[PDB]
Amino acid sequence: KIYFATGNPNKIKEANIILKDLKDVEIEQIKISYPEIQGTLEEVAEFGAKWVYNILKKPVIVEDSGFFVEALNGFPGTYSKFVQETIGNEGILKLLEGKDNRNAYFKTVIGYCDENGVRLFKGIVKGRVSEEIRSKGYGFAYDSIFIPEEEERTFAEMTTEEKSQISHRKKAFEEFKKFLLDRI
Amino acid sequence: KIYFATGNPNKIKEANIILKDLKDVEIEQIKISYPEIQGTLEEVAEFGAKWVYNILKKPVIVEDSGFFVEALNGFPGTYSKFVQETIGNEGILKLLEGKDNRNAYFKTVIGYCDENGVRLFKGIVKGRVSEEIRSKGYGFAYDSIFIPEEEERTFAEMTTEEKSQISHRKKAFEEFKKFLLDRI
């Protein structure tokens, strides 16, 4: 049993599916808020996990994710949500106007912590930003403008199952899983 | 004396000026770092104030400023530095192309914290965004695209003295000086 400090129940359902295999492990949501600090996703998740651990003192995880555009120097990055709300996807495309490098990537950092300390687990998916919003009604925010790896479709035109093995979130949770598996 | 948890010494030089008259004039820089949480400017200042106070256990002030543009919904706001270092002035001007509402404002929040608790002091200069970068060498970051109150020159084209009145930084501090003027 490991606690996930978040308000989104779906993150627990998602975590439990990637880890269903670990017969002896279970993920449970814990409604403890923590400050999300300014800094890298790593810094946000480490601080976050320690903050909740100090309070719950039981095995727990936190998570921070972001969208990074190359020609934009990694922006929006850890403030990807704030940017989505204020300038959104249109803002991103305006800023990429005339840029030849449309490369970008999503990345998730899970922050684990227990009596032994904090451990970071990462996942990334590299791709490129499309020139227009392309959507089949499938994703959130930046998904209508991100094309993963060798695909021609954006995340917004792919089903949950088409993105299940390639996503940063998926990749991050497989890393946390490795850690739980080969764990002593 | 009151400490200023800051790395810029000109900040404690700017602060002590405004503190001129007061008989407690003493503002003392102190190299104590604090987490700048994601939240409003007021949130960052409050968290930062109490954080370095619990460390130092003495009266201290922190200070957080931002550039907020109207058409862009507040952005960069409390993430002005990150935005300034990734997409720069160039980035907000592109975001603003074709927009007629070029309204914007700078804001500062001084977080004061005592053995009593936190008190916030604010300063604000409203204005508009320049159609292009304009500098004579003064100021930094967005100063060269911000035209204060009712001027025709940007902050970067005005001398430190010239914006003696149109300074969100001093306005926030004059506010702090009236709170000190009441304690004897």
Ligand SMILES: Nc1ncnc2c1ncn2[C@@H]1O[C@H](COP(=O)(O)OP(=O)(O)NP(=O)(O)O)[C@@H](O)[C@H]1O
């Ligand atoms: N209906 C839903 N409501 C809220 N959250 C959901 C829902 N469906 C799935 N989720 C969760 O939200 C996450 C995906 O968010 P999304 O914005 O697509 O990506 P992200 O990389 O986490 N964020 P960002 O980097 O800001 O784009 C998954 O981890 C899911 O657990």
